[PDB]
Amino acid sequence: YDRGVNTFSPEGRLFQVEYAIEAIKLGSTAIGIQTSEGVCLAVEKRITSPLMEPSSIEKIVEIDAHIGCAMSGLIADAKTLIDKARVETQNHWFTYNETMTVESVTQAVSNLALQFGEEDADPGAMSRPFGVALLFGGVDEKGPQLFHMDPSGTFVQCDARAIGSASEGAQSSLQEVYHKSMTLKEAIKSSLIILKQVMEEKLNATNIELATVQPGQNFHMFTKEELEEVIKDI
Amino acid sequence: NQYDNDVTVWSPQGRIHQIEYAMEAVKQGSATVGLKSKTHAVLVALKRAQSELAAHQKKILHVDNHIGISIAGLTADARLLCNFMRQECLDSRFVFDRPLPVSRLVSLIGSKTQIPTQRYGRRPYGVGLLIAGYDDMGPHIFQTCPSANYFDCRAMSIGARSQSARTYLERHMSEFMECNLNELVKHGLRALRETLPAEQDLTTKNVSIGIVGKDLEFTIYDDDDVSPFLEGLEERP
Amino acid sequence: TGYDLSASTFSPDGRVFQVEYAMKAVENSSTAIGIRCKDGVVFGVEKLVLSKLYEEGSNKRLFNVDRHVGMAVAGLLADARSLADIAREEASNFRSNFGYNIPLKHLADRVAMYVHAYTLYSAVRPFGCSFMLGSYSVNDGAQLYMIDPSGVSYGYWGCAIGKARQAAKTEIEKLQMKEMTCRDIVKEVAKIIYIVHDEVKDKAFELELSWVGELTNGRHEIVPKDIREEAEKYAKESLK
Amino acid sequence: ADIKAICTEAGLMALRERRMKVTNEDFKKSKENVLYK
Amino acid sequence: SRRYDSRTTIFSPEGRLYQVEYAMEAIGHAGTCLGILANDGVLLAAERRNIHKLLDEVFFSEKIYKLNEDMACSVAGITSDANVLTNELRLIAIPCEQLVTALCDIKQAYTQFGGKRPFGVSLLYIGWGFQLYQSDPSGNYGGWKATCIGNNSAAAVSMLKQDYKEGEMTLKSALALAIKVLNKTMDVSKLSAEKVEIATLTRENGKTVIRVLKQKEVEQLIKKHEEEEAKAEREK
Amino acid sequence: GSSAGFDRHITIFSPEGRLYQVEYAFKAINQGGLTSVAVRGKDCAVIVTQKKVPDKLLDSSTVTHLFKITENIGCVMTGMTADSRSQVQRARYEAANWKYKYGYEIPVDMLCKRIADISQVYTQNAEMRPLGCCMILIGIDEEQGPQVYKCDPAGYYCGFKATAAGVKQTESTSFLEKKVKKKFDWTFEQTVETAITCLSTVLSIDFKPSEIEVGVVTVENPKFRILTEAEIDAHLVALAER
Amino acid sequence: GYSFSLTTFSPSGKLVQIEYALAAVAGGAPSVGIKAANGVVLATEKKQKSILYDERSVHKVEPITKHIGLVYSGMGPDYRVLVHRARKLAQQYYLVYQEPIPTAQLVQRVASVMQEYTQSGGVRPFGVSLLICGWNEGRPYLFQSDPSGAYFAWKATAMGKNYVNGKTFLEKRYNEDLELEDAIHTAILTLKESFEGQMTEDNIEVGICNEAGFRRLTPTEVKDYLAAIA
Amino acid sequence: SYDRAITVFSPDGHLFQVEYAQEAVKKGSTAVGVRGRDIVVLGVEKKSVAKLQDERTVRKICALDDNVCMAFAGLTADARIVINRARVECQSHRLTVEDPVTVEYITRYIASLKQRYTQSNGRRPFGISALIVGFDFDGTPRLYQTDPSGTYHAWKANAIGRGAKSVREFLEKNYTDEAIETDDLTIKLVIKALLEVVQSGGKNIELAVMRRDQSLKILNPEEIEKYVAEIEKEKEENE
């Protein structure tokens, strides 16, 4: 249309940034909880057909052995952000021989957001914002940390953040169940309780993903047997 | 309209609406107060939290050993500007082995921000900066606008409901010069209180203070470190 | 109508409205006057303070594009500063190539072409500031050129740019500028600024004064505070 | 519409040749009229 | 810039490329171009629209172009755009399908990125086994035994769909078929040799021969067909 | 006067085959309100234009539409002042480049033929507007003699025995056409007189020796010089006495 | 610069901007080209709107090589750009082959330039049609390059204003046995029907090509040919 | 260079150019792929079969590598660019890792290439969807589907094209372990799925198969006609 990508609304809003924020509400619901024992990441696969293999829907991605990311919105757009995160990490390791902090990893991915333009831009520069919200979760010097990223490039640490279609409903339920001093098992259980209530389908060990990053331990993808153990309760 | 879709279109009234639209992004941001004395220049910021389960967005960023800023507006644009001023301050040390003067830095970001407001398809930096620094010329408080126009201010407040703080700063601007560090910070906290609603109060969670002085490096204070400043001021009437 | 959305489109009457609209920004700013006397040029800018919070010296509309050439601006300040840097780099390049201070006629003719280059294409917008360049040398003499957003540079004896330009021009015409010196003009430049200022309208202005002449050895310097206060007192007394 | 026009024109070809039975040649000449030209 | 941009390489709400379709309409108003595959050769009959009697006859052919020693092509649409494509076609030249694919990648490129208008040319390619190819401004290419592009292409394809006996065709049968198909497609009831353009590709002595039939040879084909058509009139 | 699309906003053809943007640039020449007259004689060429100084504040020494492109070539600019200087600066660069590249002074005919080539690009590419100025070069050729060439925003160019550009171009053209019909190879004095008279008669001003600028090139001195107020007054006195 | 094509396909499959460019050609001064047995003639109406214009300053019929000539109908400034490009193109052919460029080859190169401006971004098509005449292999050549970039080999054609009736006039007045001098006579006659007022030796421009090469007829020569008309 | 944002966010948060590209897929021929036990099957409807059309040139089933082949649905010209781009990367991966490309990798690259065209200046999205089938180095059959947005999923059986919704509904009900017990049964499942949208019959069915440790094999029309008779024969005994 007549409007460019880098255009400001009369209310001070970047039009394309706000529009990309609306794209997250069409994505699957992802729940991340920060706990002193670790960070739990939950997301719904949203199976649309019995023939589709649930294993192919990877909505929780290993950024590194100590940090994982949960995605919501446009999954195809998050691959570029994830690849840069997995490239920025192992670049800090190459130069400083240490694992990058979760805040720094989120900050590096955040700088990729808003680097979109129509004119006076590089040939490889993007044209539109990344219509995906990321939920970075991992352990570092500051212990377990959960960070939420939005298509606006604004990243902030969150004790318990829910993103996606049911972000409004799940966040309200998260506040009713989150306390600072709890265990990771409660955080995993509470996330599955909230997810089960917001999913269109019925919760089972094949239509969801659960990830935990514990201190000492590495990023871990919950298997079907592990998922069935916690689902069998609620 | 047809004059508000691009930054290179002059309105018939001699105005650029995209520049003014970007200026409203600062007004959407949270209030920050920057004031200075004969020997100190402090920044007081009111961090905002999207939800009570999320942390308060950082508002004061360290640029150089003697220069510190408080952002207001698009966080991504602030990082782009803050990185630029960090690099320019670093480049002065690498070349001249001297701190970059604050007046000579805001000119650079006033020209860096002016280029996008004049070329087709570019947008103004939707962030407002309150720059505090100390150099040979004394403490400074610079306010940066998305219009690429900067002001050398005795005491300025930008953000949402910042004009309530501008009133308090104007009323007590006379006693800013001779007051010590503790009184200077309290004035900014008192000014930042005017931007809050009646029921809200200054707490350690939503207050950040940055101090740069003659013999003091620029240091940012947080929830634990705001307590030595917050307890002094009395409750507002 | 679509005939005014770009600088690369002509109106059916053959006028570039984007350049004309950019001139309106200059007419919305405070007036800035400059008078060329017998032995120099004195610049006087009526610099309002939008609030008491700004320090004395903020939004300096008087620039130093070279050691001998000044610049008084009116309109959008950001483009004024950008054009000051363009004028600064034009003088630096001239010295780095030809080996002497750039003549005002060449500097005015060079910066104006940069200003004019922004009035031809839709990829850029015309500059929203008009500025006056003043210089003095023993050989060339006192010179004063005004460049508008369109890119027209003309030498002047007394020029005014801003919202009170038309009223300021009438007060300049009374002066016998071709005979008096800088020391006498600085009193009158203050008087003209105080006369054209509107106290019921936007008030609380700061008188910014600068000059370049044989009394400064052809160097553009801010008028000394002691003389500036004397000029301010004379201007205030002239208002009765 | 093309199918109905093919049939209607095909009958018109038979009416020209004074016939009540529509042949394949009548339909063949029908297609080259409505669909083409 | 954005105001004056027509956005040629964008998708319509129905998933269509409007510029590609509009270019395909230009070919529909162009001269008729035929191509028939036989067991011993391929021919390319093109309708001549430059039939003004003050038009000089200097070039070897008007719409028939030789790409390489083994290949010939004929164009329909914007003639200026045809010169760009034919000049590029010789630069790439090699197998017949390889040459068409390479050019069709160029044509598809203009329909995806660049912002320029598509090449409004549909080409018929003949080369040596023997194969006939058709290309569209979208870059969609496909082999054909008998196909037509240009004015009344749909009518000509219907005639070929009925009268092209697959496998059992020589040049003479294919050449006679081309004239008969061109006769109905053309608005001219006579179809003189000056309004048509026939080029035949054959393998001789181990070499590919690309020859444009002389005006005298074509008149024999027109004369033979009209007598053959008149022979059917004796039946009725 | 049909329109279809952006034919009035960018240099693209109208349905009847017209470039309105280029046409609008011609109306831009009249925006300055000044008229220039150039007359060519047997051994001299003269450019005459009115100079308007609305206020005494303006330095009249700077308000000049006469520009010395090179030593042997001068021009008079009509139209936007800002666009005029760019063409003059562009013409000076091309003249200097011609001298460096080819070793001899650029001919008057080839000077605008280059300038008209630059201004033609403005009428074909749509991202920039045509320069709303008119250029009239006068100079003494080595063999052809005095030369006058108008150089319009459209990229058109032609030689002229006597031409004019500005608001009163067609009024002055009719006057000069009448004088040329008499077929007189005017001397240097007569060319200045008919150039001043053409601007005087059309405008009806009765010029003073401060309201017009005269630039002459002669075969005896093939250099472009501006007539001073003392020199210009002699011709005005001669005009009054006859 | 604009990187998007300003010429696009209409819904009815026409490059509309090209058609408007051809309208500018139809509003230009008439140009007539006749290919005789022993040469080619190029004639055009070089009529000015006043006597102040120097007739010999700007020539509508310009040579390209020692044997190729141009004459146009359309926008004057656009023709000078194509004249330089054609002259540049002829030099490029001459440098690499050390042989004067064939008339047919030049038309393809020039028409390719014209075609580029139909598809290139931010530009409009040339508003002229180029009549190209030349002599190669002992045979005369005459070509027409439309704004679209399509080139036609013409035995006798007319462009510009009143070209439809000029083409008809050439239909009944041209034969392949015409000689160069009679072609000049016929070319002047073709202009006369579209000409308004009287044709002098200065208001029309004639150029011819033969074995000796292409040269533009001087005003003295055109006067002698014009005398045979009356 | 043309640097313009073709694909931009709609106010509701949708990429319309991506959605419009997906509409072009819905206008293409129906392509059906079924992943069996020891064989992977691709079935493509041949739309309209003109007797004068060389069926060899018009082929919607193409082999990216010796172990990976895909069938597309959408703009034929757009798909060929993707196939050639994937074919080039198939050889680049082979020269680097000294191992044939996995079905995930070539699907990931094609999907990433698709997404790049939905977020790059001056480029419209690819208007094709691909049904990538093949065998990994361990012999596990794999079937993948990509869409113009740039998303990829693994499917036991899937359909793309105009009749995708009906066939996928058919595949949801008939895809069982018994139905993929043998290669012949896996072949018959595709034809049954294709015959739900193909009207005339086996004439408009182009079926290609790939077996483990074997190259892609295109079924001749007689073989397809032989299979169609079996489904027709088996239909009678079930009535």
mmCIF file of C-alpha atoms in Angstrom, chain C residues 10 14, chain F residues 11 19-30 77-80 83-84 87 112 115-124 128-136 150-157 165-166 169, chain G residues 75 77-78 80 124:
data_model
loop_
_atom_site.group_PDB
_atom_site.id
_atom_site.type_symbol
_atom_site.label_atom_id
_atom_site.label_comp_id
_atom_site.label_asym_id
_atom_site.label_seq_id
_atom_site.Cartn_x
_atom_site.Cartn_y
_atom_site.Cartn_z
ATOM 1 C CA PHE C 10 5.785 20.367 -10.477
ATOM 2 C CA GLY C 14 5.180 25.482 -12.244
ATOM 3 C CA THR F 11 7.637 12.478 -16.531
ATOM 4 C CA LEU F 19 4.764 15.288 -20.797
ATOM 5 C CA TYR F 20 2.865 17.584 -18.444
ATOM 6 C CA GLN F 21 5.693 17.642 -15.895
ATOM 7 C CA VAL F 22 8.072 18.987 -18.541
ATOM 8 C CA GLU F 23 5.408 21.491 -19.609
ATOM 9 C CA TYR F 24 4.959 22.617 -16.001
ATOM 10 C CA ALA F 25 8.708 23.281 -15.844
ATOM 11 C CA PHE F 26 8.239 25.831 -18.633
ATOM 12 C CA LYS F 27 5.686 27.727 -16.545
ATOM 13 C CA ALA F 28 8.323 27.676 -13.793
ATOM 14 C CA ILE F 29 10.543 29.998 -15.852
ATOM 15 C CA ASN F 30 7.931 32.743 -15.453
ATOM 16 C CA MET F 77 19.460 32.637 -16.589
ATOM 17 C CA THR F 78 15.665 32.865 -16.410
ATOM 18 C CA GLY F 79 13.473 30.893 -14.017
ATOM 19 C CA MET F 80 14.125 29.509 -10.550
ATOM 20 C CA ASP F 83 17.933 25.775 -10.414
ATOM 21 C CA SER F 84 19.718 28.411 -12.503
ATOM 22 C CA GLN F 87 22.814 24.666 -14.506
ATOM 23 C CA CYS F 112 24.046 23.503 -24.350
ATOM 24 C CA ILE F 115 23.356 20.794 -21.088
ATOM 25 C CA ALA F 116 20.227 19.921 -23.065
ATOM 26 C CA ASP F 117 21.387 16.303 -22.823
ATOM 27 C CA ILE F 118 21.549 16.537 -19.020
ATOM 28 C CA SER F 119 18.133 18.211 -18.911
ATOM 29 C CA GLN F 120 16.696 15.565 -21.254
ATOM 30 C CA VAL F 121 17.441 12.863 -18.674
ATOM 31 C CA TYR F 122 15.299 14.812 -16.205
ATOM 32 C CA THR F 123 12.420 14.550 -18.706
ATOM 33 C CA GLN F 124 12.836 10.772 -19.134
ATOM 34 C CA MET F 128 13.668 13.881 -10.440
ATOM 35 C CA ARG F 129 11.956 16.963 -11.787
ATOM 36 C CA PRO F 130 13.099 19.069 -14.748
ATOM 37 C CA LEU F 131 15.099 22.164 -13.897
ATOM 38 C CA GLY F 132 12.755 25.140 -14.104
ATOM 39 C CA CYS F 133 15.289 27.447 -15.739
ATOM 40 C CA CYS F 134 16.164 28.721 -19.213
ATOM 41 C CA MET F 135 19.757 29.086 -20.425
ATOM 42 C CA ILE F 136 20.837 31.426 -23.235
ATOM 43 C CA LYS F 150 18.548 29.000 -25.873
ATOM 44 C CA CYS F 151 18.544 25.924 -23.664
ATOM 45 C CA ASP F 152 15.100 25.025 -22.305
ATOM 46 C CA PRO F 153 14.048 22.655 -19.489
ATOM 47 C CA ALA F 154 12.831 20.083 -22.036
ATOM 48 C CA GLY F 155 16.275 19.409 -23.497
ATOM 49 C CA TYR F 156 15.468 21.336 -26.667
ATOM 50 C CA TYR F 157 18.119 23.640 -28.078
ATOM 51 C CA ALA F 165 13.092 33.972 -22.354
ATOM 52 C CA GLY F 166 10.885 34.822 -19.396
ATOM 53 C CA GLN F 169 9.237 35.933 -24.143
ATOM 54 C CA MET G 75 10.358 14.482 -29.527
ATOM 55 C CA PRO G 77 15.486 15.893 -27.341
ATOM 56 C CA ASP G 78 14.794 12.147 -27.323
ATOM 57 C CA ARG G 80 19.558 13.393 -29.844
ATOM 58 C CA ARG G 124 9.570 6.282 -20.030
#
